[PDB]
């Protein structure tokens, strides 16, 4: 529940700024709009891009009105872009999904719909507890 760039192997970037992904927890939000990604060091013209396990800054576009019109923190748990594990397997999900967390990584809400990537679960133990299945 901290900086995750140095604790994770390279994962192919999936979600640049502006991507809208599903919200997999039961907070009340339906989707999340990616504003930025933590740990992004700048490069000219290059959009900040999120992948599995990344914390992102996001806003809710659809869902409970109490959750909208504000900047929140979320963690990516599923992505449609395929990445390659060190064991040589190339794997991808059917959808993109995120989960709303506090800046400390603690999961707001109490349940997760759909599976959770192992890369995301290893970096966020609180998210791994509520995962129906890992990878």
Partner RNA sequence: GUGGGAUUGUGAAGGGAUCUCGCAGGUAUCGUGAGGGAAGUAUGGGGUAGUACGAGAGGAACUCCCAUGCCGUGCCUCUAGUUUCUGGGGUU
CB within 8 Å of 33: residues ≥ 6 apart = 18, 19, 20, 58, 59, 60, 61
Pattern 58-97, RNA, x by CB under 7 A: ------------------------x-x---x-x-------
The residue range among 40-48, 63-71, 105-113, 124-132 that interacts with RNA, by the rule CB under 7 A, is: 40-48
Of residues 24-63, which lie at the interface with Mg ion (CB under 5 A)?
45
Handedness of CA 102, 33, 129, 28 (dihedral sign): positive
Q: What share of the chain is helix, strand, coil (3-state, %, to 5)?
A: 15, 35, 55
* Contact set with RNA (CB under 7 A): 2-3, 5-10, 39, 41, 43, 46, 82, 84, 88, 90
Chain residues binding Mg ion by CB under 5 A are 45
Binding residue ranges for Mg(2+): 45
């Amino acid at each position: 529940q901290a900086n995750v760039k140095g604790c994770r192997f390279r994962v192919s970037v999936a979600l640049p700024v502006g991507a809208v992904v599903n919200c997999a927890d039961n907070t009340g939000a339906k989707n999340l709009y990616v504003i930025s990604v933590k740990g992004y060091h700048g490069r000219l013209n290059r959009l900040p891009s999120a992948a599995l396990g990344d914390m992102v800054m996001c806003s809710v576009k659809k869902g409970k009105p109490e959750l909208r019109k504000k900047v929140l923190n979320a963690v990516i748990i599923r992505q449609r872009k395929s990445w390659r594990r060190k064991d040589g397997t190339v794997i991808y999900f059917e959808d993109n999904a995120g989960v709303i967390v506090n800046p400390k990584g603690e999961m707001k809400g109490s349940g997760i719909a759909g599976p959770v990537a192992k890369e995301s679960a290893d970096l966020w133990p609180k998210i791994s507890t509520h995962a129906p299945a890992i990878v």
